[PDB]
Design a binder for this molecule. Structure first.
Ligand SMILES: *C(=O)[C@@H](NC(=O)Cc1ccccc1)[C@@H]1N[C@@H](C(=O)O)C(C)(C)S1
Length: 247
């Protein structure tokens, strides 16, 4: 494997069509994943729409966050009520913590973590993965954790099961049903050719994280970066992994 000098503590890049590792560093290490959890919440939202259990146009009230510091949709709009479509866009695009919790509550109430982890097993994720919340925010002091290998299995299964997820994560700005314009946290859209996903994350404990995906000429790769040192270093690391991915 190439000799990369990454900021990330754990990182990897995988080819989708065979699951093969093209670079791996601490790929089995258990790491806090924070807002990367929202990829599982997105998975279960799409599963529910497909199962005829959830309407894109159903209106929901944003739940209040326990911590007023976490990034939230209500804070930048002062609007309480949103469609499921808009909450799902806000969750994926700006990483709105209140939007994710609102979707998880609608789906399964206080039993959403069980459904997150059941889906994890069903997707092939190892017992090292444990979700605690739809947003990835800590719950009663417990943290969402996974490994880079497991996050690849989740990401690849999400994209193969629900490829329309990329219609949202590929956009640098999503104009919601209501009207608000949400800016993507994915600073690499329009920078790396073919890159169209997937999701950022950050807490003090998780460091700066990013799951990226790109496709060129039929070949799609997924990169995982956990615990990089700054908001831009997780993308610098991702640029290195994507060049390895398409070597
Ligand atoms: C996911 O990791 C989310 N992280 C936070 O909300 C950090 C936080 C701040 C104050 C209190 C509690 C938690 C969101 N994902 C990151 C990211 O996408 O980089 C945000 C910083 C956008 S918030």
């Amino acid at each position: 494997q190439p000799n990369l000098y990454l900021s990330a503590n754990a990182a990897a890049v995988y080819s989708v069509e065979n699951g093969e590792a093209l670079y791996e560093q601490n790929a089995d290490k258990v790491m806090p994943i924070a807002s990367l959890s929202k990829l599982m919440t997105a998975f279960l939202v799409l599963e529910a729409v497909d199962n005829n259990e959830l309407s894109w146009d159903e209106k929901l009230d944003l739940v209040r966050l326990d911590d007023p510091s976490a990034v939230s949709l209500y804070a930048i709009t002062q609007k309480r009520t949103w469609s499921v479509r808009d909450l799902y866009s806000a969750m994926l695009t700006m990483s709105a913590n209140d939007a994710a919790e609102t979707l998880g509550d609608r789906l399964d109430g206080a039993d959403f973590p069980k459904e997150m982890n059941n889906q994890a097993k069903k997707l092939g994720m190892s017992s090292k993965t444990t979700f605690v919340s739809a947003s990835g925010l800590d719950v009663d002091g417990k943290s969402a954790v996974s490994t880079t290998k497991d996050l690849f299995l989740l990401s690849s299964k999400l994209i193969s099961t629900h490829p329309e997820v990329l219609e949202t994560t590929s956009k640098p700005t999503v104009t919601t049903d209501k009207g608000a314009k949400l800016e993507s946290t994915n600073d690499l859209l329009g920078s790396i050719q073919g890159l169209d996903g997937l999701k950022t994350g950050f807490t003090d404990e998780a460091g700066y994280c990013f799951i990226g995906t790109a496709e060129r000429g039929g070949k799609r790769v997924i990169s995982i970066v956990l615990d990089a040192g700054t908001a831009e270093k997780r993308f610098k690391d991702t640029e290195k992994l994507m060049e390895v991915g398409f070597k």
